[PDB]
């Protein structure tokens, strides 16, 4: 009965474009919206190179996903900018950037308190759980700490639905081994690696330089290192968390939980926080 | 081209219903969503009395408005619960309640800092401005401090679209031209009047027309040009940009609607004031 069209934003409504990130297909700029008087983010194709029709349908697809999948912990899409010269997804601006910045810029963030870390982990879980509970389920398939955005008060917004799929009935460190040996449980594997990354503040497979070596190692059952040096003894519920992580990134996909099951399992741990 | 249906929530997915507010047509309960594992709010019709078909179309209309009008400072609707027994709008839960609670519970909140007050005022303005910039424009027509919800970190969410209209209860927030029934373009400048009263209320932490007991007396007074009191007692000298704010308030609640700004104009005017904050 009830539906809503995604707003179309005229190009002239976007002012003060400044580069935030530039990639292969995806470039992100910050902007002022002239009507709304707020700062926005614009994920757009390169303004210099010609805009191909296959690249055009990709962006409209990603925009449709974001618009359908809106929820407290998913990046809110504000509208689409669809012009002959320009194509861009307009989203809310995230002042604190991506999660990896918080975890790995140790000068800027000397102490990242345990309650915040666990809250971040809980919110990522809640976000992906929502996606998996849509009809049909939406699988993210690109969860990275680089893709978890943080708003003004450090709440999670899941971003980058470029590789996302409807269950129809780049770095490889977050990818389950069955994706490359010569996937329904993909997101939970990534989540386990992210959990490890959040609790350690370390790059997974830091010491391994060749990505093919990581791939062979992972396919043989090697995982990011768990000891006292990587995961310190003072982590709250360290035993549960290690247990959960290791089930989350299990070699056999059947041993890995659903996000519902993962949230059930996490709630004993989160009950002890403020 | 691109559109999204509002999710339909089966009744059994809502657990642990607890009353948050009960009114004439609108009752609000908090709940657990069994799938999503989050606390939600449910704005529903009374579960005891029979659900009339005119009351049913009212709730579906309000839900359609919320779903179309989603934005950073508007209450997010998560879905609709549409059953034979039960009808409810499921929204995000707001832990800090309504704005009036922050302003008027002075034991619970002894000091409410100026930067927070101005941020609240800025966000209300941004919210209503968004509504007015939709096509067609959406006019709220029920702005009260009682209707401005505050999330976990005290950010604004505009709520209660029960009296809202597409362009093309207390009376203290109502412009005098609205008192009596041809209908004109003065119905466009309703929200800005309410905003001016809210601004006064935020800066003073006082009930507008506290000293006037009969609401009809308020109405007569307002129609003759009387407004909430501006002096040192109500609006203290230590308000940042006190002169600008008084000037803005008084233009916002002007007797002639043509003297009142659009929310775009209001945001333009506010940005000199907000530039001096963190």
Residue numbers in the entry:
A (entry chain A): 5 to 173, 188 to 200, 207 to 298
B (entry chain B): 5 to 172, 188 to 200, 202 to 298
Q: What does the article say, verbatim?
A:
NOD1 and NOD2 (Nucleotide-binding oligomerization domain-containing proteins 1 and 2) are cytosolic receptors of the innate immune system, which respond to intracellular fragments of the bacterial peptidoglycans, D-glutamyl-meso-diaminopimelic acid (iE-DAP) and muramyl dipeptide (MPD), respectively. Upon ligand recognition, NOD receptors oligomerise and recruit an adaptor protein, Receptor Interacting protein kinase 2 (RIP2), through interactions of their respective CARD domains. RIP2 also contains an N-terminal dual-specificity ser/tyr kinase domain (RIP2K), which belongs to the TKL kinase family (Tyrosine kinase-like). RIP2 undergoes auto-phosphorylation and K-63 linked ubiquitination at Lys209, becoming a scaffolding protein for downstream effectors.
Crystals of RIP2KD146N have been obtained in the apo state and with AMP-PCP or the promiscuous inhibitor staurosporine bound, without significant differences in the resulting structures. The best crystals diffracted to 2.8 Å resolution and were obtained with staurosporine. Each monomer has an inhibitor molecule bound in the active site, whose configuration presents all the features of a kinase in the active state. Differently from the ligand in the RIP2K-AMPPCP structure, staurosporine is coordinated by Gln150 backbone, while Gln150 sidechain is hydrogen bonded to the Tyr192 phenyl ring in the AS. Differently from the IRAK4-KDD311N structure, we did not observe a possible prone-to-autophosphorylate conformation in cristallo.
